[PDB]
Structure 1
């Protein structure tokens, strides 16, 4: 089996996770489930970025130690993934020693190679903007001992502390030719707009990779006064969870390099500039793709509690496109759950099964062929639906994949209206044509169910149970390659 490795970013537990975090984890889960269905040996990683000044600050506010606050927050994050039915194979926490030993050995290796050197970082910080400015780009400076931010117009404070600096500009030629060798590394194309003002050409200044002003993080083994900064600490999660530099590297050598790093748009530079340069410094292969989504603070728990899991999972992947910034409104939420799920899919299933009970006492007649004049094109549309779905799924166009699936679901409801099986049922001469129509209904529903398995966990399962499709062979993608899979009669369920 071919392998597939997909990661979410490790999330910062400075507060409760909102639907943006739910989007990212469900998106990665859909791709994980999708790839398992295609036959890949899938690993899906997610986790938490638990180091930094903010976490230390937040723990004292809880009236608790850092690890006890963190454990409490991580429990609720983990509980949310259980509720969302996320099929992640591991949960990496940066406070775990399996991570910290990797960050330590990585940092010490960069010291021994001469990649990092001791110095001091003197930067101007804005409390509002959360951005580091330089002496010359301050507005109305008062040699220079204060000033005002060019973005906010708010006064800045002198941030001055000891730091290790990473010489990243020497890997510039290798980075630029990696981009030339992988033109579509950043996906979708629009997320390359976050690469504007990269300063790879004019000169990447040495990157500050450790701080001295706080003690909550991975300590540098040869100079424990320093804590390793988020840049290297957080990014190492993708390789540390695989047991890189441990006594067992089997997961790493099986799953690295990563196929997709999934993320939100504001950390693309993180993953496309700093992360590959760090990997070159460690002489490791680079990730094949970064996939970045947009923005949408709503608690996902309320959405799952009130309307159910499928409703939440569907709405997130349907309404909020990956290549754009989606919008949460509760009006669109109720409409997506009522009109698409409950009506289009749900009435279809009820209509179809009700007629199979009414006319054949549950005995669904075997698929013979396209007997009705509308079947030839509908079967072709079924194959095209799978083909278009695939195109969208390979580009993480989840919104577009789901609408295509609903295109087919609407047409199936349309087919009932234009075949009018109740008219066929009256005439005994039309028994074969009625069974053909019933058969096409059920096969169309199966196509939709299989295609929806990555997105929804409950609904497709119950459709298979209602139609009495027990065979795991009838639930996989490969069974959608040729229409008309049920050539032997089936007993559908009596009371759905």
Structure 2
């Protein structure tokens, strides 16, 4: 089905200021978004803020400000952070938005009409910080900020409290068999694979019904009212998860403001998400509750949920981007960690990767193929006959787009970067063997062949890196003199798409692409 590629970040709680966790989650969302745009697809990338609930209201009360003022302020800090980080997200949703609330009520009403919401009790543990219901097996003894002996979440270590409320209850237990069918029928729907296995084990163990409302006093009245029962408010997670549906139904203008909410999601061709990006801490909500809601409502299910190794919720990313470069930082975060949390975030290692990979591997190579010394005519030369060594490198360059594409689609952005850099290392090796600096005098016919391959290797690697390094890719292409039309589209993944005779861009006397730093 030709649709709009719909990729989401989670919507972030506004109890605290934006931080690296949020920036990472939204970076992954953004990169996926960018890759599909580079592929020539229609894209709708979504991010935003999760503004209702007990936690946000209590954080606003601690600041001695009204929940409305506080959410608006913090949402502003989030918006500004994401502008600073130079993302290309299509819309920023807020759960306080009136159109969002409409969609929630509409969804609630469907679930109710379907017979899947009933009036019952929740008597059990709850983590206000996680906004999560927990069984007694998921808690242990612990300490709080008054040093007192309390109970805490095994998940997150935050304080838990016993709740005993009459609550609207969603019949999650009825969806165990259908969820298991879904997981088994769609074995790539949860990535990475060990998290897919974790979800399945949990659903196999059995599912309780889920409390989807709370008494309004418990939430300090800071929530969406239940349709036809103002004594109750809608659970912040049903509220929150529904942002993805709301987002898929908003017409947005050129400045990024929502102008209209369509009735039927099919009108905008976004729903359901192709990729939900989340942290590992909210997997249950996205892989169990969310599909169960959609199943109840007869709505289509997402294609993939990708759960990274970090938590959704010092090291300030805007500070480090100003210190080391924006694209460089993004590169580092995406390169340094896969789905394991174990990975070394340190000035030592940021500099190791900056110098080793960005400067010495990529940057070095860009300068070699464009310098006046080696590229004497300042153009893409026409190649002479290819040796078997030439062919071996060409093969790597030809194969790379297909390999990188599979990685980007999993999605595993670390592996995609690695694949591209393997080819970059190969090109450096090739350039070392051929010694094109010697060939300017010794054999100019041979240099044409060597230079051309080098240029084309640089173009193709750069094109596949352009979702990771959106600014630097533009600079590289300007130096190489790659016309705008050749900077995107699957057609331009092909070897040879830029014809010989293309002139390089002008240089400037101070130009480095990535400046190395002191160790």
TM-score under structure 1 length normalisation: 0.89
2:375/2:451 contact within 8 Å kept: no
Q: Does 1:380 align with 2:389?
A: no
Give the corresponding residue for 2:501: 488
Render the CA deviation track for 1:392-440: whole Å, top value 9, x for unaligned.
212122112112211222222222221122322223xx22112222222
1:55/1:66 contact within 8 Å kept: yes
Q: Does 1:103 align with 2:118?
A: no
Distance in 2 (alpha carbons) for counterparts of 1:371 and 1:180: 49
* Residues 109 and 476 (structure 1), Cα distance of their counterparts in 2 relative to 1, 3 Å cut: closer
Among residues 406, 412, 421, which one is paired with 1:397 in the alignment? 412
How well do the aligned residues superpose, as a CA RMSD in angstroms?
3.0
2:46/2:90 contact within 8 Å kept: yes
Among residues 336, 341, 345, which one is paired with 1:319 in the alignment? 336
Displacement of 1:53 in angstroms is 1.0
Give the corresponding residue for 2:362: 345
Q: Does 1:208 align with 2:211?
A: yes
Among residues 449, 466, 474, which one is paired with 2:479 in the alignment? 466
Give the corresponding residue for 1:143: none
Distance in 2 (alpha carbons) for counterparts of 1:363 and 1:151: 63
Distance in 1 (alpha carbons) for counterparts of 2:158 and 2:262: 51
Give the corresponding residue for 1:218: 224
Distance in 1 (alpha carbons) for counterparts of 2:433 and 2:165: 75
1:9/1:263 contact within 8 Å kept: yes
Number of residue-to-residue matches in the alignment: 485
Give the corresponding residue for 1:48: 49
Displacement of 1:363 in angstroms is 3.3
Give unpaired runs (5+ residues) of structure 1. Answer: 141-146
2:30/2:45 contact within 8 Å kept: yes
Distance in 1 (alpha carbons) for counterparts of 2:98 and 2:159: 40
Distance in 1 (alpha carbons) for counterparts of 2:13 and 2:232: 21
Among residues 169, 175, 191, which one is paired with 1:171 in the alignment? 175
2:138/2:153 contact within 8 Å kept: no
Among residues 444, 448, 451, which one is paired with 1:435 in the alignment? 448
**DSSP 3-state at the match of 1:486:** coil
1:138/1:148 contact within 8 Å kept: no
* Residues 491 and 32 (structure 1), Cα distance of their counterparts in 2 relative to 1, 3 Å cut: closer
Give unpaired runs (5+ residues) of structure 2. Answer: 142-148, 251-259, 512-519
1:239/1:252 contact within 8 Å kept: no
Give the corresponding residue for 1:415: 430
1:124/1:135 contact within 8 Å kept: yes
More divergent stretch after superposition (483-492 vs 454-463): 483-492
Give the corresponding residue for 2:271: 256
**DSSP 3-state at the match of 1:286:** coil
Q: Does 1:240 align with 2:257?
A: no
Distance in 2 (alpha carbons) for counterparts of 1:48 and 1:248: 23
* Residues 62 and 36 (structure 1), Cα distance of their counterparts in 2 relative to 1, 3 Å cut: same
2:120/2:167 contact within 8 Å kept: yes
TM-score under structure 2 length normalisation: 0.85
Render the CA deviation track for 1:239-295: whole Å, top value 9, x for unaligned.
012228954435665111211111111212111111111111111111111111111
Distance in 1 (alpha carbons) for counterparts of 2:138 and 2:32: 44
Among residues 454, 469, 482, which one is paired with 1:456 in the alignment? 469
Displacement of 1:156 in angstroms is 7.3
* Residues 183 and 225 (structure 1), Cα distance of their counterparts in 2 relative to 1, 3 Å cut: same
1:30/1:454 contact within 8 Å kept: yes
Distance in 2 (alpha carbons) for counterparts of 1:90 and 1:165: 32
Render the CA deviation track for 1:161-214: whole Å, top value 9, x for unaligned.
23111112223332222223212221121112432652x456422211111112
Distance in 2 (alpha carbons) for counterparts of 1:156 and 1:263: 23
